Amino acid sequence: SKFGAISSVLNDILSRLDPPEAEVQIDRLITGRLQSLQTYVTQQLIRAA
Amino acid sequence: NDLCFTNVYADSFVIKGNEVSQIAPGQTGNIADYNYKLPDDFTGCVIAWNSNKLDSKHSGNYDYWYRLFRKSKLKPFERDISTEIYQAGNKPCKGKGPNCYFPLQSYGFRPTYGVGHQPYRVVVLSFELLHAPATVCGPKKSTNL
Amino acid sequence: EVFNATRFASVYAWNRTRISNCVADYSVLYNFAPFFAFKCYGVSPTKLNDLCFTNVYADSFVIKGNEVSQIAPGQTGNIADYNYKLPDDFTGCVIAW
Amino acid sequence: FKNIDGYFKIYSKHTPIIGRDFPQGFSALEPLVDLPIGINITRFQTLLA
Numbered sequence: 153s154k155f156g157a158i159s160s161v162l163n164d165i166l167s168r169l170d171p172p173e174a175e176v177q178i179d180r181l182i183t184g185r186l187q188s189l190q191t192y193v194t195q196q197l198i199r200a201a
Numbered sequence: 202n203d204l205c206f207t208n209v210y211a212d213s214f215v216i217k218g219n220e221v222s223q224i225a226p227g228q229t230g231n232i233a234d235y236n237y238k239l240p241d242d243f244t245g246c247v248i249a250w251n252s253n254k255l256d257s258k259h260s261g262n263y264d265y266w267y268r269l270f271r272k273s274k275l276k277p278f279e280r281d282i283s284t285e286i287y288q289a290g291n292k293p294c295k296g297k298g299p300n301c302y303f304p305l306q307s308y309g310f311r312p313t314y315g316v317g318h319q320p321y322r323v324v325v326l327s328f329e330l331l332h333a334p335a336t337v338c339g340p341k342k343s344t345n346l
Numbered sequence: 347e348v349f350n351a352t353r354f355a356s357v358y359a360w361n362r363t364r365i366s367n368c369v370a371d372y373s374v375l376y377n378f379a380p381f382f383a384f385k386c387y388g389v390s391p392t393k394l395n396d397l398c399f400t401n402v403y404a405d406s407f408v409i410k411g412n413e414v415s416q417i418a419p420g421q422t423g424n425i426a427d428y429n430y431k432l433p434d435d436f437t438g439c440v441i442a443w
Numbered sequence: 444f445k446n447i448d449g450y451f452k453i454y455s456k457h458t459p460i461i462g463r464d465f466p467q468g469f470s471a472l473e474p475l476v477d478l479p480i481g482i483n484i485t486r487f488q489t490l491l492a
């Protein structure tokens with residue numbers, strides 16, 4: 153999921169855009185992927201309980 | 202004028218019109234890559250004002266210089282002052298002419314150029330807003346602890 | 347075929363070749379002419395083999411020596427005014443040999 | 444000595460340790476001067492008496 157950025161591949165965004173502009177897109181990717189991981193961890197917690 | 206800076210660095214130079222757009226944190230172009238490079242985490246001010254009254258005269262003026270030919274990139278806030286002819290092909294050639302280019306060309310300026318070609322006097326200021334004993338301030342105020 | 351031509355047109359009638367559907371390797375350009383003026387404005391002579399472009403125009407004309415320095419964006423002269431004027435916003439390179 | 448972003452840093456601690464060679468007991472290092480050189484360093488050399 154592109155999460156609202158240009159592309160979904162980190163090595164693509166890094167190799168295609170400069171650091172200080174690709175920073176916004178990689179921040180968006182961090183905020184999306186980490187939220188997904190958080191949701192997964194919470195569901196795992198409920199199932200484990 | 203309401204802050205404290207540990208050390209202030211004032212660089213100075215003369216450049217053309219589009220180069221003012223070029224000069225910025227982490228930009229592209231021969232001026233930003235072989236002539237002057239700012240750090241990505243730059244904390245400071247850039248100042249540019251058109252100056253065609255001192256950097257221009259009748260019959261032209263070619264005293265200024267700028268580098269287009271350098272083997273690698275510039276690291277932030279480095280010099281590199283040197284006159285070494287760029288290597289082309291595989292020749293160890295040392296001189297002017299074919300496949301042996303002078304590293305820097307003239308930045309000649311005249312009173313009659315376009316706006317993008319008009320002498321744009323650019324000075325930059327570097328600041329260090331870190332936790333250290335500062336030196337420079339503005340209006341100073343003091344109350345009893 | 348643009349640099350192995352034998353009848354490079356004059357400046358008053360500058361041949362313009364539209365280059366399309368090809369891979370732009372610049373080593374065939376480097377080995378074909380011992381250049382004397384390979385100045386670029388929008389890109390770098392070195393930084394060109396790793397760039398993609400939509401369309402490429404190769405204008406070829408034989409001209410005098412000082413006219414080589416005349417040919418540049420934001421210039422003047424009997425060639426830059428009446429024969430061939432380079433736009434100030436030019437993204438390309440010139441080659442003189 | 445270090446030269447990150449210029450700002451030459453000199454750390455030191457003077458003490459008549461056991462004196463055989465480099466000790467084994469832990470010792471800290473107190474910075475003495477921190478001065479912004481802002482130049483290019485590649486090679487290092489020492490002077491004598």
Ligand SMILES: *[C@@H]1O[C@H](CO)[C@@H](O)[C@H](O)[C@H]1NC(C)=O
Pocket residue numbers: 349350351378
């Ligand atoms: C034309 O092509 C031939 C064959 O590769 C080459 O030997 C010659 O140098 C070329 N001449 C020019 C002017 O490009």
Ligand SMILES: *[C@@H]1O[C@H](CO)[C@@H](O)[C@H](O)[C@H]1NC(C)=O
Pocket residue numbers: 354355359360361362
């Ligand atoms: C441009 O080059 C082509 C190559 O085939 C030639 O036929 C044409 O006449 C040339 N034009 C001029 C103005 O020389």
Ligand SMILES: *[C@@H]1O[C@H](CO)[C@@H](O)[C@H](O)[C@H]1NC(C)=O
Pocket residue numbers: 275276279280281483484485
């Ligand atoms: C420091 O000097 C060395 C030797 O001249 C050079 O290779 C290196 O690029 C320099 N580093 C700079 C100027 O950032």
